[PDB]
Each structure stands twice: as structure tokens, then as C-alpha cells.
Design a protein around this ligand. Structure first.
Ligand SMILES: NC(=O)c1ccc[n+]([C@@H]2O[C@H](COP(=O)([O-])OP(=O)(O)OC[C@H]3O[C@@H](n4cnc5c(N)ncnc54)[C@H](OP(=O)(O)O)[C@@H]3O)[C@@H](O)[C@H]2O)c1
Ligand SMILES: NC(=O)c1ccc[n+]([C@@H]2O[C@H](COP(=O)([O-])OP(=O)(O)OC[C@H]3O[C@@H](n4cnc5c(N)ncnc54)[C@H](OP(=O)(O)O)[C@@H]3O)[C@@H](O)[C@H]2O)c1
Lengths: 285, 295
């Protein structure tokens, strides 16, 4: 009766073991070379502290050197810009990211901050340059955001070809929904994007052979809506922790489904690490 | 109950007359301010010369100063790059474009040339940075490529709100389909993008309250596929021989117009729909760049 469970915890563990061996091999080819990631944080949110620790731990396990810079809540845009410039110019840093959302007492234009990141170091793929390449099909020389990247990998774990499928993406954010659409489209799905102004959400969802949900609305996508045999990818982290999909009903209709926790979340961290290792390898050129 | 015809020739003429008045007024509000467009050409292709002259003439009618830089076929990539850098840095120039395709005896990386354009001057909207802003919903200050821009304008001429409609885009090219998707999405349509690998294209098309077709496949989208009451926007320019026409050839769209006009509530003809919009949209983007520069 139930959907096969796409176990992101196990899959991510296989990815991290491969990345580790790749990193060990780079270091034996070029001794003293150390791939390096930096994470710049503004403020002191509890959830951001937890996510960053998970990232630092994965990095150290793979043999990536990881630096965490934590700026106070008094930080201004102009101070964040100086750090980004410093990370851009530090040739020991192969990739870096800015943890979102920024936690400051001052107004900081997030887009302007992100877009000061040098594109070759933008391992989160959130610069307009990288978004622009992805959105137009040029996946050759481009970092892709870590969440959609992990989702695509989960979709591929089913062995079902994406080409020609009707995919539905619920959500259109910069971090998840919009790039998710792009990845599905340039893997030759026919893609429908939904958002908060979509009418008859249920009827749109029901057309998805592939369904990716990234709304942050706890369990709003009902199992009833899911197309029989669909692949269901659920990005939601909502406070127990639950997804954006009503799992117990959706599991009876899908052929493949991601649980929450242990689905998309661990896969996201593995892809960040993969992008980091890519940046380090490109720099060795 | 046949479709109202969206007359692109008339609408574009209204747009160009309003832009003129706006430009006259900017110059009176800030005397000495001169909106300025540059077009950089490489080589001497006949078709490019024709298109450029049309753009220069529209600009001069509106009161935009238009400069044409024409480099010879002997030009190298590094010389093209130097001109782009110079246009980027010339504070009198608010917008410029590079006419494509380049006509040189040397290898010139087109993508690299285009992507040296400063985003704030990229009136054709084809730089990666500008594509990226548009694709992620920064519609306040990015540039929009001229064809999808004109499509959106035609859709708005109907007075039917876009928000909550199911829009279908057939095609995903850099120049039309992809930016078209972005405009519809950030106007709050629910958007489906189809392409050459879409299965059951007819059934996908039939879900479109708004349909934009940009395939280059003459009359492939049949009237039977059109949802009743749909807005149909047809970007196709396909040449077919026809001895009964003044110049021995007709232009048809990517939509089978005669059958689609019986099903749509609004439809663009070909010729005379999307095509005449395009030069006016370039002019509109140029006026936007000049206004943003004016702070
Ligand atoms: N595992 C990870 O590392 C990770 C990373 C990022 C995100 N996520 C999770 O994924 C979820 C989404 O995050 P985000 O950054 O993409 O969030 P976000 O920026 O809040 O965007 C939510 C999106 O869902 C849409 N939406 C909201 N209510 C909806 C409704 N009733 N019907 C349809 N669409 C609706 C929004 O519509 P509008 O655009 O119209 O506002 C928007 O596009 C969250 O639970 C987040 O915690 C996880
Ligand atoms: N000023 C003007 O009037 C103007 C300006 C621009 C464009 N246009 C016209 O608009 C049309 C499209 O031009 P473009 O620049 O977008 O061309 P293009 O680069 O060739 O793009 C064609 C697009 O349509 C898709 N397509 C092709 N055959 C299809 C089929 N059988 N079923 C579904 N989708 C199919 C292609 O799919 P894949 O992506 O899968 O290959 C692609 O995304 C042309 O007639 C062009 O002349 C007019």
C-alpha cells in the first residue's frame, strides 16, 4: 500500500562518504591544499545557529575546512559588505555563503549583500548571475541552490526519467521554488508553478507526476490532492517537526515520498558540501 | 462570439506617442537632460542595417538621442569588449545594446560580449544578471526583453486581471519563452511552461486562460487546442510563399489563427500583433533607464 520512502539521511550519507574520498584524494594529489568554506552570519538566531552547526559538522567530516564568522545584531549593511569583500579577496576561501535571514536591528538589503558575492565562490547559488544562468538553461558553469539541488537528486533516486513528466512546484521563492522550477524545466519536465495566488491549488497539485512543495504552510497539501503514483518531494520544516505535505495521507497515494524530518534537509547539506568541493576543484585550475 | 483582435500596430503607435510626450516633459523638467541610447554593431549585415535604422528612427521621433557605432568585419573580440566598457562608463549613455548576430571574420564569444554589458544599461534585457533579477521577481528595476515585454502589454490591453489565471507558455527560449514565464509568474498567474519534450501539448495548451506561443513552428497550435475564452498571444513570424500577396509571401503565426479566433476572447493577429510592439518596448526600456539614471 504505502509509497517507497526516499531516505534522505541514508542517501546524504552515501554522498558525504564519496565527497570525503574525493577530498582525501585531492589532498594526496596536492598535499597541503585544503578546500575551504566560510559561513557569514548576522545576529544570533537559535535556528540559524543549529543549521550552521550541522553544516560545520558535515564539512569537518568530509575534510573541508569550515570557518564561521558571526556578526552582532548592531551590524550595518556597510559592515556586511566589508566582510564579503574580504571573503571574495581571500584566496584561501574557495566558497562562502551568507546565512539567511539576516538578524540585524538595521535595514539591510539582502539582495545587494548576496550580489556582492563573487560568482565563482557563490556555493549557495543565490547571486543574480548564477540565478540568471540557471533560469535560462545554462547549467554548464553555474552553482545551483542547495535545496533544489537536493530535491533533484531525490527525484533521480526513484530511477523515473524526468523528461516529459508534468511537474508541479508549490512555492516560488529565490531559495527553493523558483530554482526548483528551473531545474525541472531544463531536465525536460513540463512545469507548473503555484504560489499564494493560485486558484484551485488542489486541481493544480493533482496534475503533478512530480510534486515539489516549498511553502512553509504546515501540512497544507492534502493527500487527496496527490496524483496516484506521484513522486512527492516535501521541503517544509514546520514547528514536532512536520512538512508542507500531510504525510500520512500522501504516502497512500504517491509511489515515492520524502519524509520530514530526514528527507530534503540532510540532502541540502550534502549538496552544499558538493558545491564547495566543486569550487575548490575549479580553483585548482 | 469571435475574439476581439489586439491590434499591435495601433497600440504600439499609442505607446510611442506617449513616450514622446514623456520625453518632452523630462527635458522640460530637467533642462539639458537628454535620454540617450547607443547601438553597437559589428560588421555590415543587410538585415541588421535595416533593423537598426528602424530603431534609430523610432528613437529620434520620441526625442531620444540615438548613436550607432558600426565596427568593421575585421574587428576582434578585444575591440568589441573595449567599446562595451566605454559605453558602460559613458555617463551620457543611459541604455545600449549589441545588435546580434555579430558579423566578423574573427571568432567572437557572443555570450561573453553580451555579459560585459552593465546591467543598469542593458535595455535588451539579455545579460545573465538581468535575466536573474527578472526570473526572481525584481520587476521594479530590471529590463525586460522587448518581445515578452510587448506580449505582457497586449495581455494588459484586454483589462482582464492576470492574477490567479492559469497561463501557458509554449516555448522556453532566452529571448521570448523564459522571460515570458517570468513576467506572467510575477504578475501572479499560475504558469505552465511547455517545450519540444512536452507530452500531450494539446491537452496542456487547453488549460491556458492566457496562452503565449513562441515556437517558430508555423500554425502548429490548432484552434481546437485553445481554451474557450482564452487570451492568445502569438509571437510567431513564419514565411510561407503566397503569389496572391504584394511581395509573394505571407507571414503566419505559431497559432492557426482562423480557427483560434473563434475560440479565444482576445487574440493577436500575425502580421500586426506582437511584431509591431517590439520597437516601442525597446524605446520604453530606454526611457526607463534614463528615468532611473535621473535618480
Ligand atoms: N532544508 C533546507 O535547508 C531548507 C531551506 C530553505 C527552505 N526550506 C523550507 O522550505 C519551506 C519554504 O521555504 P522558503 O525559503 O522557500 O519560504 P518562503 O520564502 O516563505 O516562500 C514560501 C512560498 O510558498 C508560497 N505559499 C505560501 N502560502 C501558500 C499557499 N497557501 N498556497 C500556495 N503557495 C503558498 C509563497 O507564495 P508567495 O510567493 O505568493 O508569497 C512562496 O512562494 C519552509 O518550511 C522552509 O523552512 C528548507
Ligand atoms: N520581433 C519579432 O517579431 C520576434 C522576436 C523574437 C521572436 N519572434 C518569433 O517567435 C518565434 C519563436 O522564436 P524564439 O526566438 O523563441 O525561437 P527559438 O529559440 O527557436 O525557440 C523555440 C522554442 O519553442 C519550442 N518548440 C519548438 N518546437 C516545438 C514543438 N513542436 N512543441 C513545443 N515547443 C516547441 C522549443 O523547445 P525546446 O526548448 O525544447 O527546443 C523552444 O523553447 C519565432 O517564429 C520567432 O521569429 C519574433
Amino acid at each position: 500500500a504505502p509509497a517507497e520512502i526516499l531516505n534522505g539521511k541514508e542517501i546524504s550519507a552515501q554522498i558525504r562518504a564519496r565527497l570525503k574520498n574525493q577530498v582525501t584524494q585531492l589532498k594526496e594529489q596536492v598535499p597541503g591544499f585544503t578546500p575551504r568554506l566560510a559561513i557569514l552570519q548576522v545576529g544570533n538566531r537559535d535556528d540559524s545557529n543549529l543549521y550552521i552547526n550541522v553544516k560545520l559538522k558535515a564539512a569537518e567530516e568530509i575534510g573541508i575546512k569550515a570557518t564561521h564568522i558571526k556578526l552582532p545584531r548592531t551590524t550595518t549593511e556597510s559592515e556586511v559588505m566589508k566582510y564579503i569583500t574580504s571573503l571574495n579577496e581571500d584566496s584561501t576561501v574557495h566558497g562562502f555563503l551568507v546565512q539567511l535571514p539576516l538578524d540585524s536591528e538595521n535595514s539591510i538589503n539582502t539582495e545587494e549583500v548576496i550580489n556582492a558575492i563573487a560568482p565563482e565562490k557563490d556555493v549557495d547559488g543565490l547571486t543574480s548571475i548564477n540565478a540568471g544562468r540557471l533560469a535560462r538553461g545554462d547549467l554548464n558553469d553555474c552553482f545551483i541552490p542547495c535545496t533544489p539541488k537536493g530535491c533533484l537528486e531525490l527525484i533521480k533516486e526513484t530511477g523515473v526519467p524526468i523528461a516529459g513528466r508534468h511537474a508541479v512546484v508549490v512555492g516560488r521563492s529565490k531559495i527553493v521554488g523558483a530554482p526548483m522550477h528551473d531545474l525541472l524545466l531544463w531536465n525536460n519536465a513540463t512545469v507548473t508553478t503555484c504560489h499564494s495566488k493560485t486558484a484551485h491549488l488542489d486541481e493544480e497539485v493533482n496534475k503533478g507526476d512530480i510534486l515539489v512543495v516549498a511553502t512553509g504552510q504546515p501540512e497544507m497539501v492534502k493527500g487527496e490532492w496527490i496524483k496516484p503514483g506521484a513522486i512527492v518531494i516535501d521541503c517544509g520544516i514546520n514547528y514536532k517537526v512536520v512538512g508542507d505535505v500531510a504525510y500520512d495521507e500522501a504516502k497512500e497515494r504517491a509511489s515515492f515520498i520524502t519524509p520530514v524530518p530526514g528527507g530534503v534537509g540532510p540532502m541540502t547539506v550534502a549538496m552544499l558540501m558538493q558545491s564547495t568541493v566543486e569550487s575548490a576543484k575549479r580553483f585548482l585550475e
